[PDB]
Write a protein that binds this ligand. Structure first.
Ligand SMILES: CC(=O)N[C@@H]1[C@@H](O)[C@@H](O)[C@@H](CO)O[C@H]1O
Ligand SMILES: CC(=O)N[C@@H]1[C@@H](O)[C@@H](O)[C@@H](CO)O[C@H]1O
Lengths: 625, 625
């Protein structure tokens, strides 16, 4: 590859990206031009490449590599619909992306066309004088954040931290020392009005001000009981919509002190000013709150977040609700990686297509693609690359015609192969448009003796689905190069699910039929083999985790999986005592299984959504007193 | 032994009790008399024994066996201070007392002098038409409760179910079906004013009405956020003291429909009407509430519960507070068995002495001794027998001069030997008068690599304390007869704690000193042996659990211990990886350990209180989303 017109910075960036893409032997003249986000023209090995914004050079090169495998003549012109496209990684659900993996992620985002990289850190960044904040969580040092940001800057990608300045601070506020307890209202919510809370928040911005970036998402989502705990005890009943504004104004003043411009999640305005306390509502704004908001709206960008709607109209409705408060809006979409071990790129594609229509219809300047890790971070950080390419394609081209070819240029895999990563969730009888259906997770963590999700299993279809999935994924692993770990992990999981999906039911059928030879088989052969496979899964999972994340947080998985293993040993031992005639009855097996949840009771399929480890694993108490 | 004056019922009861006590070959003439709770006179093999209330015969027999070992001549007269002395077993914290153990407990309570046996059941009794209420919890059927009660009736011991009609329903309200969710306010609290809530409660009393007893404790403690969840969203802001009264009225109306008389925990009146939301307060009663409350207080007995005070004076202050609301009061004291694996009979003794003074000074007629099982029910049900004998002696004699001798008649062990059961809690530098200090539990469940309670350990003291305790307990085990299991369990726990108390610290010390030999030894000898020892403990614990309780709830302990075991394996593997030179640092060990809590920071000792498994075991998230 011969380039003319590059700076040293750009030539060095390109050197890094040769680790992902193969530049052919051609001559490319490069310039900045406002004419297009990306333009590439020329033929017979001599090409002219222009970008509007510096970071767009890297997507241009991915396009160039792609189209030259196909043809000698190139006519590319792209007009991105969004001023900014960002990817936000969850670093608060136990999985803290390690620095080396943050660098890989940045490289890929740059090839895809993202302008912005973001980390969501509730308590997982260090604040001077707050030793419990992020303690044993692998909180990023200021230096690590600076290194990560500086790396992104190598590709003209900007960095935006997503923090919390109200709720979602559960891992911090649990620490039973006065310096932390005095900051609390209730649950995971900080105490509005308490000066020590504003000292903490000032501390958050002092840390962040060590970065170059002056753009921040301050959070403030899901503070459902705000003003109703220690706040209510100290101050009595207040208008909670005004309370939100008072808090918001204090935080904005602190941001201003450090020169930051803020975004925030939008949901609490709607929840606190709607009759049934929900996000998706047209709001009745009390006049005093309307006056307060009118002055605050000019100082903050509201982020409408929605990972769920299957149609443009549903989004547009919410955009119209938001316009009643502000026209300075951004949108946050979803790269589904928060439903256990296995992502849902398929569902992500479905909703992105529709969200992109709505966002364009409402002149949304910025889309933030979110990669949440709900309830323990058990899905791989790189599991959702197809979703990321999907949104990039939608911004730059408004279609997916180039999705797989650009994807294979950037990763070595076709997007279709990569999206087989979803397989543990893709039961055949599901419609593609319902969210959160996560058998990958609940089949895995379910008990043996007390299988409380058993009514949601359909062994005739599920067993061969999982078995075939494991074979499909082993084949993809062998051609996945450096992405192999992802597929190996999923293959082993599907192998486990193919038998575990009904082992609990088979134990009960054998018990009821008095088939003792079968119980003996299950206790002495199948369940010990099940433990061996789970330990193999745990090893693969640990390799995956340690490759992507800091070690901190893996401990919760160690605990969860060690518990599962011990519960399988209980199944073995209880069966043995019964077979030895030292029990008349196995009481666990005498209990009739009820539906776990009725959330999809009306549908013809049996699967469901169950995404809390502690209620998957047992009907007993385990965290409560 | 030969008796005259016995009914058939009494003759049958004494036959059963010969299983516990050794009646000497003497002649006893028995009659009821008003002259004393119990009197015994006579000599030379011929005795006259009177009792006031039928159940007191059985304590009288315990006393007779005791004194006849001392002497031929007998002069006994007792006047009990309390009309009723009850023991309440927690059957809601995962450990549901099996029917066989309920019968043993009743037999022992009879010999001690208790008039009343109680079971605390949040969701752990069956309600027709409510299939999720007690699901997979080992909830008692009506027939099991009837059997337990009829068995108590054999000894003229009455039965009082303790239930919940407001909060503490967490194991039920988690179930994600509409028929459960529609009953919810917030957290573990039912939705006041919802008719389906009142249908549920009617169901509760429908079940209980199948019993003979017409006395019930309806709960209503600790509903901290009542009115502030779904209640607030549906109904707006209301006077919460009035809300409580409205709910209470409804519940009492349901009780009246079935002929019940109610007791209730008193705390929410004080908490809702005090300015800081605390129990130990003389409260200003709002005017509208006083009207409502004065009516309600004539329909229910308030139970002042307090397990913590080391002085009469503090109890007296709270009695005075209560007396400004009602003179229809009972008192609840504590047999401390809710702080992990190991009871605190010693601390129970200390507070009982002072509480007994206060109850006597305030004319209290009924004392309920409570045996809570907080956060998984991991302490043995029979671990607190000394605390039970203590309260019986305080009622009947107003002193403990007879405590050890009556205890040994009743159990075969001196009370001093039995109370060694407490040892895993009895660190030598603790004063006797501070509650909740439970190294038994937190030393056990603490992580290895990330030992977040390490600052609370005092190895030079604690190590020989635990090792010596294990020997002491092994000796007592050998003379404990049918109670041996209790001491066997505790012996193995103390053996584990003597090394585990500082294994995390020694790993850190060897790591910093670069003592790779000690790291090897710890990885390859100590930690595998530790896992072996914990598996033995798990085996002993399981035998104890299955002897005393239903199998339901053991699963949570399997999970917890399974997870601990797996975390010890992680410590082994991380060290190995490091020893192999495939890591430059073990990041877990580079984190400086802070105090876990400042609760007892001002004291001379290092130990503390930490009684939530999920926060002992990890600093990561584990139940939150
Ligand atoms: C702003 C926002 O997205 N908040 C939460 C987020 O933390 C994560 O849990 C996500 C996926 O389930 O759901 C949202 O309710
Ligand atoms: C009425 C009552 O005693 N309520 C609770 C009880 O459930 C138990 O948890 C106990 C020991 O901690 O503490 C209490 O505050």
């Amino acid at each position: 590859v011969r380039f003319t017109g590059l700076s040293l910075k750009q030539t060095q960036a390109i050197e890094v990206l040769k680790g992902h893409i193969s530049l052919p032997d051609v001559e490319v003249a490069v310039t900045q031009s406002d004419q297009a986000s990306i333009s590439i023209e020329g033929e017979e090995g001599h090409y002219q490449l222009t970008y509007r914004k510096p970071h767009q050079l890297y997507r241009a090169l991915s396009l160039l590599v792609t189209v030259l495998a196909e043809a000698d003549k190139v006519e590319i012109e792209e007009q991105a619909a969004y001023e900014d496209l960002a990817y936000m990684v969850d670093c608060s659900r136990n999985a803290v992306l390690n620095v080396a993996s943050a660098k890989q992620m940045i490289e890929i985002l740059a090839l895809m066309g993202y302008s912005t990289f973001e980390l969501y850190m509730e308590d997982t960044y260090q604040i001077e004088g707050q030793p419990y904040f992020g303690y044993f969580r692998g909180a990023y040092s200021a230096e690590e954040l600076q290194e990560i940001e500086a790396y992104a800057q190598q590709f003209d990608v900007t960095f935006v931290p997503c923090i919390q300045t109200l709720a979602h601070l559960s891992a911090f506020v649990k620490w039973g020392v006065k310096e932390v307890q005095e900051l609390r209202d209730v649950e995971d919510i900080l105490l509005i009005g308490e000066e020590k809370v504003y000292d903490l928040i000032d501390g958050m911005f002092a840390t962040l001000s060590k970065l170059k970036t002056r753009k921040v998402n301050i959070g403030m989502d899901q503070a459902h009981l705000v003003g109703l705990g220690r706040y209510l005890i100290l101050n009595g009943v207040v208008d909670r919509s005004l309370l939100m504004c008072q808090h918001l104004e204090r935080v904005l003043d602190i941001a201003d002190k450090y020169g930051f411009h803020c975004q925030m999640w939008s949901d609490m305005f709607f929840k606190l000013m709607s009759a049934d306390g929900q996000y998706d509502r047209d709001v009745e704004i009390p006049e005093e709150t309307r006056v307060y908001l009118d002055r605050l709206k000019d100082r903050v960008t509201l982020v409408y977040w929605d990972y769920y709607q299957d149609s443009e109209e549903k989004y547009n409705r919410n955009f119209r609700n938001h316009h009643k408060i502000s026209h300075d809006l951004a949108f946050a979409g979803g790269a589904w990686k928060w439903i256990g071990f296995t992502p849902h790129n398929h569902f992500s594609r479905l909703v992105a297509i529709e969200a992109n229509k709505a966002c364009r219809a409402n002149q949304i300047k910025e889309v933030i693609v979110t990669g949440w890790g709900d309830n323990g971070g058990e899905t791989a950080q790189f599991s959702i690359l197809p979703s990321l390419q999907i949104w990039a394609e939608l911004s730059y081209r408004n279609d997916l015609d180039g999705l797989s070819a650009h994807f294979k240029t950037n990763t070595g895999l076709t997007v279709e192969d990569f999206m087989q990563i979803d397989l543990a969730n893709l039961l055949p009888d599901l419609p593609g448009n319902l969210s959160g259906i996560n058998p990958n997770r609940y089949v895995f963590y379910q008990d043996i003796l007390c299988p409380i999700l058993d009514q949601h299993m359909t062994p005739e279809q599920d067993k061969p689905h999982f078995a075939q999935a494991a074979e499909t994924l082993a084949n993809i692993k062998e051609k996945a190069g450096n992405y192999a770990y992802l597929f190996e992990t999923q293959a082993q999981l599907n192998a486990i699910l193919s038998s575990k999906v009904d082992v609990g039911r088979r134990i009960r059928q054998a018990y009821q039929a008095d088939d003792k030879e079968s119980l003996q088989q299950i206790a002495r052969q199948e369940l010990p083999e099940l433990r061996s496979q789970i330990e193999d899964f745990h090893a693969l999972f640990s390799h995956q985790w340690l490759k992507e994340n800091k070690v901190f947080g893996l401990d919760t998985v160690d605990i969860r999986m060690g518990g599962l293993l011990q519960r399988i040993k209980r199944a073995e031992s209880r069966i043995e005592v019964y077979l030895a005639g030292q029990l008349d009855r196995i009481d666990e097996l005498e209990v009739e299984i009820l539906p776990f949840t009725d959330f999809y009771a009306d549908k013809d399929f049996a699967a469901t959504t169950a995404n809390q480890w502690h209620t998957i694993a047992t009907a007993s108490t385990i965290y409560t007193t």
